[PDB]
Write a protein that binds this ligand. Structure first.
Ligand SMILES: O=c1ccn([C@H]2C[C@H](O)[C@@H](COP(=O)(O)O)O2)c(=O)[nH]1
Ligand SMILES: O=c1ccn([C@H]2C[C@H](O)[C@@H](COP(=O)(O)O)O2)c(=O)[nH]1
Lengths: 316, 316
């Protein structure tokens, strides 16, 4: 099926990957350099061998597409993928007066009752970003996130470039353009960035009326990360195809360091016992066309019949 | 042999590639997304199925490594790969008083005697950059070329980042770093660039004492371009390995648009009749270590026994 390339990557890393130490101190099995393609006319690459929350992937994509960098939009759609970053900044500032929470990500995963004090602490934070319009502007805005990188690349002359926006006008006026690249890797910010872009750069390609996209991802958490990533970009490939009035081609995922954290081997092994189900289909609101003014409801996924989800510890 | 991946890419494009129009108006056969690896411990990937001028590749690499952006260093080592760019700027300025040479690249390939007036014109230019220290600073400096992109990434705060230099200190202090990327794609300069980077970005990787490098190349001229490119980066992988005191791993070449210009089909077809010869070996000056202060003589290639070169028209 469509998602067999994923299952293959995982197998590969299981028996070929070599042990490798890392930033988080959870070890990993790793390979360097890997690529896979998904013919997007065959169906949507949302994994069936495990239940992946599509809702989180699209609320985050639309957050990106809007050029939004404030955690608030996410919280409103009950999406907490980035809270950990906003909270972080907050706990290390003056306004914060409370149970310190230093190196919390670890401690939550390591202590029972701390985890409980931490989430109540976070509970207030999310609610406070959700309600205090000033607090939100102050602690809700991450600044350098894909949205701003994609749509507001700050220049040296103090202005801003709508990188993606320009690229799309280019696909229209020059579909055969070999230079259709959008980049999220800013060399001058990367050294002081808590998390320099994982999805470093991507390129569009047009031929025979079909649009294709290749993504260069420097680091991949094969079990926890890759499944979400695949969906974000295939979705993105469908949106851009929609706007440009082109048919959908393939999504080529290129990898730098594709790894498996040692604390995930039993799970990936289990998922590999499962047979792929037929793939879901993507359905976009035909009446609307400007993808930049797209919202939750203009994107429907039909026929997603996945195996149950698989819990897994996080790496830190 | 080592270079079989190249021969495969070419075959692939021959029967799988689809016709595609382009910038230069010479048509092409193209594929999107392709990757190949070269185990650098097996030998140096300088093609044997065709004689490729290694001298040009290293004088250009050392020009890059020095952070030099002046055509002058090249001319001195009788390397003319970039003259066409300097000349271009010159002919379209005040100081130039002479036989206009508009759209020359084409005309040379299209008219007999114009080609002769053009090269004498260029002859003077190269000599004038080679001798008039002021002319050279004025017309010899291209500005935005890999050297400056690699070593003097201009920031918004007016300063400069030694991108590659930092990355190398990083390989030393944190070889397991997943974030070891050097980038040449500046979003704010790309729109007014005569030729936005073809070699967009590359990443290093360390494990088991071996250093590997993956290159993301957005556009590839399979016949004329790819053979030079492969050598530049494998060489670069050997130099960095030298400095960091690491063994050499693999060179993974990832491609965006890998194409064959229609005006090259008879040649690639001919090269495909040839059987690969054993690969040459690379030999670096052990006494010297700082690759930034490396020059022509500290890099020797032994046992290069290639088939004769293959003339081919250029695309415009
Ligand atoms: O969309 C994403 C974001 C992150 N990661 C993972 C990759 C690594 O497991 C970790 C980042 O590690 P570094 O490369 O920064 O060291 O997060 C993904 O796989 N996909
Ligand atoms: O190192 C290089 C430099 C250039 N090219 C080729 C690729 C294309 O044939 C042309 C650039 O075309 P655009 O992508 O800019 O359209 O030059 C290479 O293959 N390798």
């Amino acid at each position: 099926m469509l998602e067999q390339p994923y299952l293959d990557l995982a197998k590969k890393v299981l028996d070929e990957g070599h042990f490798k130490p890392d930033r988080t101190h959870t070890g990993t099995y790793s390979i360097f350099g890997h690529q896979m393609r998904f013919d997007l006319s065959k169906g949507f690459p949302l994994l069936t061998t495990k239940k992946v929350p599509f809702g989180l992937i699209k609320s985050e994509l639309l957050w990106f597409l809007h050029g939004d960098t404030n955690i608030r939009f996410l919280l409103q759609h009950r999406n907490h993928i980035w809270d950990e970053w906003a909270f972080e900044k907050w706990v290390k500032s003056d306004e914060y007066h409370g149970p310190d929470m230093t190196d919390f990500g670890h401690r939550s995963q390591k202590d029972p009752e701390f985890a409980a004090v931490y989430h109540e602490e976070m509970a207030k934070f999310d609610d406070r970003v959700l309600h205090d319009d000033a607090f939100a502007a102050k602690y809700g805005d991450l600044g350098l996130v894909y949205g701003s990188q994609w749509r507001a690349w700050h220049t040296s002359k103090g202005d801003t470039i709508d990188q993606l926006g320009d690229v799309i006008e280019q696909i229209k006026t020059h579909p055969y353009s070999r230079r259709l690249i959008v980049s999220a890797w800013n060399p001058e910010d990367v050294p002081t960035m808590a998390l320099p872009p994982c999805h470093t750069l991507y390129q569009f390609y047009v031929n025979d009326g079909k649009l294709s996209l290749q993504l260069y991802q420097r680091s991949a958490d094969i079990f926890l990360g890759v499944p979400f990533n695949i969906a974000s970009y295939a979705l993105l490939t469908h949106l851009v195809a929609h706007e440009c009035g082109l048919e959908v081609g393939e999504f080529i995922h290129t990898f730098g360091d594709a790894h498996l954290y040692v604390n995930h081997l039993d799970q990936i092994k289990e998922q590999l016992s499962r047979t792929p189900r037929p793939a879901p289909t993507l359905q976009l609101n035909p009446d609307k066309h400007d993808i930049f003014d797209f919202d939750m409801k203009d994107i429907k996924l039909l026929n997603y019949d996945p195996y149950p989800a698989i819990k897994a510890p996080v790496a830190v």
